[PDB]
Copies of this chain bind each other. A is one copy, B any other.
Amino acid sequence: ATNLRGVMAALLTPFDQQQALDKASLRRLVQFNIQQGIDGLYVGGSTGEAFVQSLSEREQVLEIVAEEAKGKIKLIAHVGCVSTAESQQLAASAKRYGFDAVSAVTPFYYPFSFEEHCDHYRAIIDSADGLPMVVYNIPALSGVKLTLDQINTLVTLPGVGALKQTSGDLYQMEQIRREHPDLVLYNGYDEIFASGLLAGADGGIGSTYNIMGWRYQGIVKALKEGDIQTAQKLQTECNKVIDLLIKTGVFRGLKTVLHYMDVVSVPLCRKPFGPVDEKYLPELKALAQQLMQER
Contact = CB atoms under 8 A, between A and B. Distances in A.
Contacts of A152: none
Contacts of A287: none
Interface string A180-208: 00000000010110111011100000000
Majority SS of interface residues in chain A? helix
Contacts of A191: 170-171, 174
B199 A195 contact: yes
Interface residues of A, number: 62
A189 B141 CA distance: 23
Interface in A2-53: 19, 46, 51-53
A92 interface: no
Contacts of A194: 198-199
Contact of A55 (B54, B108, B192, B271): B54
Given A52-B81, A120-B271, A178-B240, 13 more contacts: A51-B109, A51-B110, A84-B272, A107-B272, A108-B109, A109-B142, A110-B141, A117-B272, A120-B272, A170-B192, A174-B191, A194-B198, A195-B195
Interface of A: 19, 46, 51-55, 81-86, 107-110, 112-113, 115-117, 119-120, 123, 141-143, 168-171, 174-175, 178, 189, 191-192, 194-196, 198-200, 223, 225-228, 231-232, 235-236, 239-240, 242-243, 270-274
Q: Which 5 A-B pairs have the closest CB atoms?
A: A226-B226, A84-B271, A52-B83, A171-B191, A195-B195
